Amino acid sequence: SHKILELYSGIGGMHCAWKESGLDGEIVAAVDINTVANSVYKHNFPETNLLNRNIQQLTPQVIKKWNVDTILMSPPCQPFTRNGKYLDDNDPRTNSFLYLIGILDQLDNVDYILMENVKGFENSTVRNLFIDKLKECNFIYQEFLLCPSTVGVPNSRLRYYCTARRNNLTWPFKRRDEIITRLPKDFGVPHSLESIIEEDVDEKFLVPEKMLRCAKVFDICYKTSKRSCCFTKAYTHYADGTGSIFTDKPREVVQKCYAAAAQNEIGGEKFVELFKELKLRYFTPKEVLMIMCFPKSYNLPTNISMKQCYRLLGNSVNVKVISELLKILFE
Numbered sequence: 001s002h003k004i005l006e007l008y009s010g011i012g013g014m015h016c017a018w019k020e021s022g023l024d025g026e027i028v029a030a031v032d033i034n035t036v037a038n039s040v041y042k043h044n045f046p047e048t049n050l051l052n053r054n055i056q057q058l059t060p061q062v063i064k065k066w067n068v069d070t071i072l073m074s075p076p077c078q079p080f081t082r083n084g085k086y087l088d089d090n091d092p093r094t095n096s097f098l099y100l101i102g103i104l105d106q107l108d109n110v111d112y113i114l115m116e117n118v119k120g121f122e123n124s125t126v127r128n129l130f131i132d133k134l135k136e137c138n139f140i141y142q143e144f145l146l147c148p149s150t151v152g153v154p155n156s157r158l159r160y161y162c163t164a165r166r167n168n169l170t171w172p173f174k175r176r177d178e179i180i181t182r183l184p185k186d187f188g189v190p191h192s193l194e195s196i197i198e199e200d201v202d203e204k205f206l207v208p209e210k211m212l213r214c215a216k217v218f219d220i221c222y223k224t225s226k227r228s229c230c231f232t233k234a235y236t237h238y239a240d241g242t243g244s245i246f247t248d249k250p251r252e253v254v255q256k257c258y259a260a261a262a263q264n265e266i267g268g269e270k271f272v273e274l275f276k277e278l279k280l281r282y283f284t285p286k287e288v289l290m291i292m293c294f295p296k297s298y299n300l301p302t303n304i305s306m307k308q309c310y311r312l313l314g315n316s317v318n319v320k321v322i323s324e325l326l327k328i329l330f331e
Ligand SMILES: Nc1ncnc2c1ncn2[C@@H]1O[C@H](CSCC[C@H](N)C(=O)O)[C@@H](O)[C@H]1O
Pocket: 007, 008, 009, 010, 011, 012, 013, 014, 031, 032, 033, 034, 037, 053, 054, 055, 056, 074, 075, 076, 092, 096, 312, 315, 316, 317
């Protein structure tokens, strides 16, 4: 019944979320300029129209012929300016979102829009313009600031959301101008991480010594943990702010090591030997996929490397949160 245009499709978290919603619709087109991401997307959705094309090459005309009524989009935060000068409009690394805001008034068929964005977008000049273009085009909307930890998922991933909708379609949802911090539906307390952890985990995921020098700023998780830090694209590149670290050892054991390592030179030789025996390891791409609520049928190609995997995973969406917003957007 619904024709979806999936912009900045990435590895296709939106597509995964549309399925989880139970809603009637097809993805008629997914648009992304990243060849690796596209390859991952094609692997899981061989059937889906995937276009290696710039968002700015997308015309109202071609969007109209596709007969899309629904847009799913997660535009990245990219610059418009570098050290005093405007970035070029055909440089692939400049923000493309302004183009969308422009062409909105001529997307006559588009009825439903869902966008994910970074925390802080809601305070941006772009956001103010974007909302302003919605009102102009007779769209009604709700903005959210949601974390998966409120949707019963043991992970932090604070993101901005906007569910925008044409006002001539009856929307039962009691919207409001102030930002919503949690959905009306209560999911209770996030489950532990045991459901999503494998026993036969390869030693390649063990945190390396150079990394173990930065042990002081690691956030550690255990099987009983009901939370974890936000995974980024820099997970396993740097030790810090990039995501949580896991161990099978009791948290009490972890504390003794930290104490014993405190009576040593930081990042030191003796400092590292103590942390080496904690068996700290990264989450596997599979685990991160389960953490981000992708389905088990969803798998990654073995032809792409670990570093590629984590970069792609760090840019993706939580499938569960979007599925819940899709339900709200279409009620
Ligand atoms: N101008 C543009 N046209 C098409 N795709 C673009 C683009 N600018 C950035 N992108 C792509 O959009 C992605 C944004 S990250 C969001 C990806 C997606 N939500 C997922 O589940 O993975 C990046 O991977 C980037 O390759």
